[PDB]
Amino acid sequence: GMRVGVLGAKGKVGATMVRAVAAADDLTLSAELDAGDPLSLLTDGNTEVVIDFTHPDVVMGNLEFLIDNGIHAVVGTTGFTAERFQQVESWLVAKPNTSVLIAPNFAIGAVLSMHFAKQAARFFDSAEVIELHHPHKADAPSGTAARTAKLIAEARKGLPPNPDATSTSLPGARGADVDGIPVHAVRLAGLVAHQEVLFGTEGETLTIRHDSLDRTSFVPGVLLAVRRIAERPGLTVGLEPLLD
Amino acid sequence: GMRVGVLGAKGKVGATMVRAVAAADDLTLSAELDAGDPLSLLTDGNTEVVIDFTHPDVVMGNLEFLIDNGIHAVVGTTGFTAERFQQVESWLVAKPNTSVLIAPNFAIGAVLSMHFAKQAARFFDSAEVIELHHPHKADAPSGTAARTAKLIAEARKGLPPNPDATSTSLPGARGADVDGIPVHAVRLAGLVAHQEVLFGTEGETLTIRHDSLDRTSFVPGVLLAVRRIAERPGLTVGLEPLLDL
Amino acid sequence: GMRVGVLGAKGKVGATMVRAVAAADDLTLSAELDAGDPLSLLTDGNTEVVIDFTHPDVVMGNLEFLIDNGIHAVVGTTGFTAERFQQVESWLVAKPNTSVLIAPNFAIGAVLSMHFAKQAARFFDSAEVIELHHPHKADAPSGTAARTAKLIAEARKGLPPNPDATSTSLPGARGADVDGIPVHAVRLAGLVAHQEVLFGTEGETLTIRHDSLDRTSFVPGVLLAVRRIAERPGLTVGLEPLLD
Amino acid sequence: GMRVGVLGAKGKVGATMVRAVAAADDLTLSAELDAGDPLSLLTDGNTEVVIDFTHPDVVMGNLEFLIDNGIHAVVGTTGFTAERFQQVESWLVAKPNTSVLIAPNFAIGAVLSMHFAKQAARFFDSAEVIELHHPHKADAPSGTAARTAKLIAEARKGLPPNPDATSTSLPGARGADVDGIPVHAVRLAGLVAHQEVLFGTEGETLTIRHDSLDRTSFVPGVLLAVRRIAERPGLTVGLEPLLDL
Ligand SMILES: NC(=O)c1ccc[n+]([C@@H]2O[C@H](COP(=O)([O-])OP(=O)(O)OC[C@H]3O[C@@H](n4cnc5c(N)ncnc54)[C@H](O)[C@@H]3O)[C@@H](O)[C@H]2O)c1
Numbered sequence: 001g002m003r004v005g006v007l008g009a010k011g012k013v014g015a016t017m018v019r020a021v022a023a024a025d026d027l028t029l030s031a032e033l034d035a036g037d038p039l040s041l042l043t044d045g046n047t048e049v050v051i052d053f054t055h056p057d058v059v060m061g062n063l064e065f066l067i068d069n070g071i072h073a074v075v076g077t078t079g080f081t082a083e084r085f086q087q088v089e090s091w092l093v094a095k096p097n098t099s100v101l102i103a104p105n106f107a108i109g110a111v112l113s114m115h116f117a118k119q120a121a122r123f124f125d126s127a128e129v130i131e132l133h134h135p136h137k138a139d140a141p142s143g144t145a146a147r148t149a150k151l152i153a154e155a156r157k158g159l160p161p162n163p164d165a166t167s168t169s170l171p172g173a174r175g176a177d178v179d180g181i182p183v184h185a186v187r188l189a190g191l192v193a194h195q196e197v198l199f200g201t202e203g204e205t206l207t208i209r210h211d212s213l214d215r216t217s218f219v220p221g222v223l224l225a226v227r228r229i230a231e232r233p234g235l236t237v238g239l240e241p242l243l244d
Numbered sequence: 245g246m247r248v249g250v251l252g253a254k255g256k257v258g259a260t261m262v263r264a265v266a267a268a269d270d271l272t273l274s275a276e277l278d279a280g281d282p283l284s285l286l287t288d289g290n291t292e293v294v295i296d297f298t299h300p301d302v303v304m305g306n307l308e309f310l311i312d313n314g315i316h317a318v319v320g321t322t323g324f325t326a327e328r329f330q331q332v333e334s335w336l337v338a339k340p341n342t343s344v345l346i347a348p349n350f351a352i353g354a355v356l357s358m359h360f361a362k363q364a365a366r367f368f369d370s371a372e373v374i375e376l377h378h379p380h381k382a383d384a385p386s387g388t389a390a391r392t393a394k395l396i397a398e399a400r401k402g403l404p405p406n407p408d409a410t411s412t413s414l415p416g417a418r419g420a421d422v423d424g425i426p427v428h429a430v431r432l433a434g435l436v437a438h439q440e441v442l443f444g445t446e447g448e449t450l451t452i453r454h455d456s457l458d459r460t461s462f463v464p465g466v467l468l469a470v471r472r473i474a475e476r477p478g479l480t481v482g483l484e485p486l487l488d489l
Numbered sequence: 490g491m492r493v494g495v496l497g498a499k500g501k502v503g504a505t506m507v508r509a510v511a512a513a514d515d516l517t518l519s520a521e522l523d524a525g526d527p528l529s530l531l532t533d534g535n536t537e538v539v540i541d542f543t544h545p546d547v548v549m550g551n552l553e554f555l556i557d558n559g560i561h562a563v564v565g566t567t568g569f570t571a572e573r574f575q576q577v578e579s580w581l582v583a584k585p586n587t588s589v590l591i592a593p594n595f596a597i598g599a600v601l602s603m604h605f606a607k608q609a610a611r612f613f614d615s616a617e618v619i620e621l622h623h624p625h626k627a628d629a630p631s632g633t634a635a636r637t638a639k640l641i642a643e644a645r646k647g648l649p650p651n652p653d654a655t656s657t658s659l660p661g662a663r664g665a666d667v668d669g670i671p672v673h674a675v676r677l678a679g680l681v682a683h684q685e686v687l688f689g690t691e692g693e694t695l696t697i698r699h700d701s702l703d704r705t706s707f708v709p710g711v712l713l714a715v716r717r718i719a720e721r722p723g724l725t726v727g728l729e730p731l732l733d
Numbered sequence: 734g735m736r737v738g739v740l741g742a743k744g745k746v747g748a749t750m751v752r753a754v755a756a757a758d759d760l761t762l763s764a765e766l767d768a769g770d771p772l773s774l775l776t777d778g779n780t781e782v783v784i785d786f787t788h789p790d791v792v793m794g795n796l797e798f799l800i801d802n803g804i805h806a807v808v809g810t811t812g813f814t815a816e817r818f819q820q821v822e823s824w825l826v827a828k829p830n831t832s833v834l835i836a837p838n839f840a841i842g843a844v845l846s847m848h849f850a851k852q853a854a855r856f857f858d859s860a861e862v863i864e865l866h867h868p869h870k871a872d873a874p875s876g877t878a879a880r881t882a883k884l885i886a887e888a889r890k891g892l893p894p895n896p897d898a899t900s901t902s903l904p905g906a907r908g909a910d911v912d913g914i915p916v917h918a919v920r921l922a923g924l925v926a927h928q929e930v931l932f933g934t935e936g937e938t939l940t941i942r943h944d945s946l947d948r949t950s951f952v953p954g955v956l957l958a959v960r961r962i963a964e965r966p967g968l969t970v971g972l973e974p975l976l977d978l
């Protein structure tokens with residue numbers, strides 16, 4: 001059984017992961033840190049892997065310590081840039097046996113969904129994204145939808161644009177344009193989080209739908225990442241490569 | 245056994261209805277007119293009901309003749325304004341046994357779907373419409389989606405608006421506003437014509453989806469209208485009242 | 490504001506309805522009874538309407554008292570037969586101003602869904618039902634699905650059967666037969682309760698889908714019934730007539 | 734620029750592929766054979782690739798000739814057993830530059846859908862397949878659904894079975910069992926061919942849906958196979974490996 005530490009243990013996600021690690025028989029909780037706890041608590045407790053959902057301003061310092069001490073890191077904290085990835089990559093040159101996974105989404109369905117979308121995108125004339133959320137959601141479209149449409153568009157570099165004969169419309173009917181890909185945002189009481197990618201070509205359509213029916217649906221992807229992170233030395237960006 | 249005439253018999257929809265009337269055992273084709281044929285061909289053939297898919301510039305003159313001679317009319321021709329409806333209603337006062345049905349949708353699935361949407365609308369916090377069509381379609385949103393959202397909005401008079409906390413958006417993300425109801429138009433190769441109405445309230449959602457997989461799916465609604473139109477004297481707007489719901 | 494009592498106040502549903510009535514500004518909780526409390530508590534507190542989710546063995550006695558004292562009843566308790574409806578009908582002859590609503594389902598979406606299904610059934614060649622539930626569900630198909638298929642079949646009396654050319658099949662592929670209507674039951678981790686009715690005819694299909702994303706989704710139908718029950722004197726069976 | 738022959742040129746699928754090859758600018762029709770035409774017509778016309786949709790009783794003899802003369806083969810003909818596959822593999826050892834693709838589905842949407850299903854299968858507690866077809870369909874479940882469920886089951890070797898507390902059921906409610914995966918077959922007028930794979934785990938679900946709205950939707954997959962088959966020497970089973978995923 002692996003020894004797992006949690007950074008950000010009192011936060012919304014951290015406290016959830018503490019409970020998840022305690023429930024899982026194969027993972028033993030080795031340390032549980034929040035703000036102001038020294039990172040040496042992780043080595044004092046023989047931690048092998050850490051789950052980090054902290055804050056963009058502290059995650060770089062934490063990562064330096066972790067990599068330095070041979071502690072694998074599963075990181076959900078956001079605010080990662082190209083420069084930050086570089087820096088992490090450089091720290092790992094010194095520590096070739098250490099694995100760091102930095103991912104913006106740990107829901108397995110969402111991760112598979114994005115990957116399927118990217119793989120299918122080149123074979124169809126048309127692609128559109130539809131996302132549906134509860135009406136308390138502030139941003140339209142969602143981050144996941146906009147990220148998905150950007151991947152689709154990138155996979156479609158050098159294909160013709162979506163065919164569209166629209167010559168009379170009310171404004172807004174055709175959705176938002178995200179790198180040439182229409183994205184539609186439905187806001188409906190009674191929903192949680194849902195996303196459909198639609199692909200079409202004469203004669204056939206393909207749809208990939210992800211439905212998240214509770215806020216904690218990301219937990220198994222984080223546990224999966226903890227159980228597998230050591231299979232890939234160095235930096236992995238996104239959960240997809242651990243899934244393979 | 246009914247005697248049925250078709251006006252617009254060489255058009256896309258007219259020629260299709262000619263074939264449909266000929267196939268149906270209980271309906272006899274009595275006349276088949278296109279542009280330049282005199283309307284007296286209808287009475288020379290003892291027409292009881294006419295199916296009219298012509299053009300907004302000729303339908304009012306055809307209707308006057310039909311109503312005047314007691315010939316029931318099933319009309320799919322568009323461009324009908326509130327004033328034109330009022331005018332047809334006024335002609336019928338003189339001819340109280342004549343029936344005229346004017347309808348923008350004859351597909352039974354689409355008609356049912358609109359009627360369900362109107363009935364469900366008062367009972368949910370949220371309503372939205374999604375329509376999906378082949379990418380050769382000129383208008384967004386479609387006439388059917390816009391008409392549906394208008395019915396939903398009318399059924400929701402005096403309820404709060406759709407709840408929406410959206411404070412950051414890219415333009416167009418939330419669709420087009422049709423009388424307070426968002427409408428989203430997907431344009432996708434490989435589709436024909438598709439519409440979903442979504443209703444929601446905390447804890448549950450209800451969805452009504454109509455899929456039309458061929459362009460002639462409207463034919464049974466028109467035949468149904470022809471078979472039933474005489475049951476309702478006067479002007480009927482929309483196919484729903486003849487459905488006997 | 491109406492004065493509402495709850496019978497079965499300590500039960501799963503009752504305790505939920507107590508909270509719902511207390512939250513609603515227009516409804517004032519007048520009495521809150523469980524097993525062993527005398528029904529005179531309802532009249533002592535000037536109750537106008539009672540919500541009753543008790544048990545089939547006690548609901549008939551409760552109903553007699555309620556009807557006798559001019560207290561409208563919204564009843565979710567099950568185990569109602571033709572004889573029991575008759576008996577209720579006869580008690581109401583004496584009390585023509587009293588309203589009693591007995592309903593097997595208070596989720597508005599489920600009630601509308603069944604009604605739409607019944608109204609559409611005669612216009613299509615084919616009808617099938619698909620229901621999807623979490624895998625902890627004991628019964629397949631669900632009660633709602635089987636009830637829905639029976640209504641569809643009744644609305645289809647005197648039409649031809651569903652066309653089906655199936656001549657080679659694995660057994661079970663075509664679902665369960667409920668009065669000539671195929672019903673399919675999906676059991677999937679991550680679902681709550683979902684039902685689709687599918688109708689088809691050459692050239693077109695119509696689908697009516699109900700999704701319940703939490704166990705308390707019936708609450709607004711019960712509150713709706715409490716707010717409207719007085720609009721119909723006598724016995725109403727099912728929530729549909731109050732919706733109209 | 735490739736020279737493409739069609740075997741089975743008068744059949745339903747063969748005649749359709751003849752027209753598709755003629756329309757494509759980069760493929761030249763080199764020969765067009767039906768039953769009773771000698772195979773030497775293929776070599777007399779300098780055929781590089783053949784599309785074969787014939788009949789399980791003739792395809793093995795055709796394949797022998799093709800492989801022997803270095804002609805790549807894209808084969809949609811069914812009735813291929815494990816032993817026949819092994820036999821084709823054995824012929825190709827002698828002809829290491831020849832490529833043969835044998836595939837039960839050429840619709841790109843269907844092929845992708847199966848591949849996604851296989852990739853998602855290990856990561857969810859539950860998997861089920863729903864297929865929907867027009868009511869003239871003879872087999873339930875369809876070959877595609879059964880093949881899909883078999884792939885899912887194989888990807889799930891060594892995981893627990895689908896959780897299911899069902900203790901009371903009407904027969905058939907839970908579908909057909911195909912290697913531990915429930916498959917449900919809907920037969921509905923107005924449909925063509927449709928398949929959904931559903932995966933679930935506490936808190937989330939993932940659905941992959943393929944809709945084919947016409948019977949010729951397989952044509953681009955066959956053309957894609959013809960254009961790429963030479964990239965993979967030897968026997969390829971299924972279209973997926975040529976998709977370059
Ligand atoms: N990738 C994903 O799937 C995903 C999903 C949700 C949230 N997030 C991200 O994860 C992060 C956490 O989200 P949250 O909602 O739980 O935030 P939160 O503010 O509720 O929790 C963060 C916790 O980290 C603690 N913390 C801060 N600095 C620390 C340090 N140096 N050492 C130990 N603990 C420290 C804080 O005291 C706090 O308790 C955010 O950056 C958010 O954007 C990612």
Ligand SMILES: NC(=O)c1ccc[n+]([C@@H]2O[C@H](COP(=O)([O-])OP(=O)(O)OC[C@H]3O[C@@H](n4cnc5c(N)ncnc54)[C@H](O)[C@@H]3O)[C@@H](O)[C@H]2O)c1
Pocket residue numbers: 496497498499500501502503522523524525526542543544545547551564565566567592593594595596707
């Ligand atoms: N129609 C619907 O939508 C729907 C939905 C769920 C449950 N139900 C039905 O409603 C009933 C209640 O369900 P539950 O899960 O809350 O059951 P429960 O056993 O949790 O609650 C029943 C409560 O009623 C109380 N009770 C019994 N006799 C009483 C009396 N004479 N006076 C006052 N209280 C009394 C019990 O003490 C208990 O607390 C069941 O019959 C069930 O089948 C209906």
